[PDB]
Amino acid sequence: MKIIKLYFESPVHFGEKRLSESKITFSADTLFSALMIEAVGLGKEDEFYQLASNNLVKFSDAFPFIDQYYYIPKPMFNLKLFKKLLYVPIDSLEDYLSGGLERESFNLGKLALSEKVQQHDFKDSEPYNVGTFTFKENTGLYVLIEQTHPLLEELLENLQYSGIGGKRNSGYGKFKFEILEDSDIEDLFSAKGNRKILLSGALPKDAELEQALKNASYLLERRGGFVQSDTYATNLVKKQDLYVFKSGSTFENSFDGDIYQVGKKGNHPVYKYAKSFFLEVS
RNA sequence: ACGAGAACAUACGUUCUUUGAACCAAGCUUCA
């Protein structure tokens, strides 16, 4: 298991339904879509989808990190006996679970709002506004992968000089990436456990959804939007809405998701990575 | 096949109008 630490050199915009509103981090849907667009840029989207569908690449949602501290979302535990807390460090999960344990503050950056206009010559200009998020100086995001492949690294390097998120051609989203294989996180992931914490925006297939929802504390998340290409349907069109579990969810039974197809009435398919990525705890 | 594509926070706008560096003031005091 390896890491992809994303040190950002620019404001980002990772909107949820907006241009004016943004979140601090992105998801596996967006990174899979970005890598698929970089694959069709260099003609390897048949290879990349065959790698991703056969579980040769498996990446979680991008998660925050401050100095030598990797963070994950606050796992929804259904324990019996920190509402403003949202991110607990991944190494501190055992003694966060063993008792009511806050050691240091969580600061990643702060949100912003860019004020832009759409200038007209002989007409009054149109204001609009882009909500952004600027990271702090020695912070960023990381993505957990395992058994990395040279195609994944080539596509990541091509995505590095293209932009991640929204409004990327208009000033945002540039970053640099690094692998930096760690030893503590891989030992934390290799250990089994009775309860497993989801880490990507997954959705089980229709023959395992009942098995997945047994002793489950989940949160559904609507993950859709408009199709970003040029060869799809000669006008802007919204893909199929897919409701996946949120990345902080916690399950008893394991599952492997699917790369669902959300675009069918077009010249090329549109995919949505809802494969499952788990972390075992006790 | 990234809640995404496209989109200048842009256009018009004199740091400008008043007002004396004036008023007071033996180159003079003792010298065949």
Residue numbers in the entry: 1 to 81, 92 to 111, 116 to 296
What does the original paper state about this entry?
The multi-subunit Type III-A CRISPR-Cas effector complex (Csm) exemplifies this principle and is in addition regulated by cellular metabolites such as divalent metals and ATP. Recognition of the foreign or cognate target RNA (CTR) triggers its single-stranded deoxyribonuclease (DNase) and cyclic oligoadenylate (cOA) synthesis activities. The same activities remain dormant in the presence of the self or non-cognate target RNA (NTR) that differs from CTR only in its 3′-protospacer flanking sequence (3′-PFS). The single-stranded DNase (ssDNase) and the cOA synthesis activities reside within the Csm1 subunit and the RNase activity resides within Csm317–19.
Interestingly, we obtained two apo structures with different stoichiometry. A second apo structure was also obtained from LlCsm without incubating with a target RNA that was refined to 2.9 Å and contains all but the Csm2 subunits (1120344151crRNA1Target0). As all Csm subunits were present immediately before making the cryoEM grids, the reason for the lack of Csm2 in the 2.9 Å apo complex is likely due to its dissociation from the complex during plunge freezing. Nearly all particles that went into the reconstruction of the apo structure contain no Csm2. Though still not clear what conditions led to the capture of the apo LlCsm in two different stoichiometries, it indicates instability of Csm2 associated with the apo complex. Thus, when Csm1 is well ordered such as in the apo state, Csm2 is loosely associated with the complex, which could lead to its disassociation. In either isolated or the CTR-bound state, Csm1 is active while in the apo or the NTR-bound state, Csm1 is inactive in cleaving non-specific DNA. In contrast, when Csm1 is bound within the apo-Csm RNP, it is immobilized in an inactivated state.
